[PDB]
């Protein structure tokens, strides 16, 4: 669920 900043 945690968005990948890249």
């Amino acid at each position: 669920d945690v968005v990948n900043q890249q």
Partner: antibody, heavy 120, light 109 residues
Framework: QVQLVQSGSELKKPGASVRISCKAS????????MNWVRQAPGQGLEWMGW????????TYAQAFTGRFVFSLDTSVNTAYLQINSLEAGDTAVYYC?????????????WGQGTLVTVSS | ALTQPPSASGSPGQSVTISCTGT?????????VSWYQQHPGKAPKLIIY???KRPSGVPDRFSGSKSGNTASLTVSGLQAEDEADYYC??????????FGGGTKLTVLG
């Protein structure tokens, strides 16, 4: 080693613009995101947002939209923070901070910080 | 947005524990809580990530945990160099990062 080197301190007048550079060495620049963090004198850290070095897309924290631009020059492995329409309350040390893999919400390496002083 | 007590203190060799209270939408929702140590006029340094993990070079004297909506950093075996400001941070369900206000740790005696 992984290193983030920022440009020198600057004085700017109200309403002017300033651009701070954060030059990355020691790793593949386009492989990891870059975050920006502000610290007003005597105050705490504030997250400003992040930029993807793969797409170039910036994402700004709610308090830092409108006047703040994250940008990149990949050919010189450099991330840039531009502040426009400078205000007295913009006086702060600004840090670039690398996003540790796999998602970038941990800051493993930090630039040494740049003091921007806004004053007439 | 994250709540830390303003200060902390301990004697050389003893332990200090610093709290960092968020919400179910950050500290209580995810495992991306970080702790940074900052000496005056220096860049912050990562000492704990993902609630309990340590980056290269940080001794196990430093430990992190969380329960419910509050994360906690424990510095055991306090030394003079530990005197510094400590900041927690966490990911949010809004896909942002929030910091705590910081805790100034002083070594007494």
């Amino acid at each position: 080693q992984v290193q983030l080197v920022q440009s020198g301190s600057e004085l700017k007048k109200p309403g002017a613009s300033v651009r701070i550079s954060c030059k990355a060495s020691g790793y593949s620049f386009t492989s990891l995101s870059m975050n920006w963090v502000r610290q007003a004198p005597g105050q705490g850290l504030e997250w400003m947002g992040w930029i993807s070095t793969k797409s170039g897309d910036p994402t700004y924290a709610q308090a830092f939209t409108g006047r703040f631009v994250f940008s990149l020059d990949t050919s010189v492995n450099t991330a840039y923070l531009q502040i426009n329409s400078l205000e007295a309350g913009d006086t702060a040390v600004y840090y670039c901070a690398r996003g540790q893999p796999p998602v970038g919400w941990t800051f493993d390496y930090w630039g040494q910080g740049t003091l921007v002083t806004v004053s007439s | 947005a994250l709540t830390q007590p303003p200060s902390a203190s301990g004697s050389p060799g003893q332990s200090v524990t610093i709290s960092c209270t968020g919400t179910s939408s950050d500290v209580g929702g995810y495992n991306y809580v970080s702790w940074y140590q900052q000496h005056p006029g220096k860049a912050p340094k990562l000492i704990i990530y993902e609630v309990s993990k340590r980056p290269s070079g940080v001794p196990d004297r430093f430990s992190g945990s969380k329960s419910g909506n509050t994360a906690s950093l424990t510095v055991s075996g306090l030394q003079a160099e530990d005197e510094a400001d400590y900041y927690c941070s966490s990911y949010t369900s809004s896909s942002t990062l929030v910091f705590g206000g910081g805790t100034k740790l002083t070594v007494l005696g």
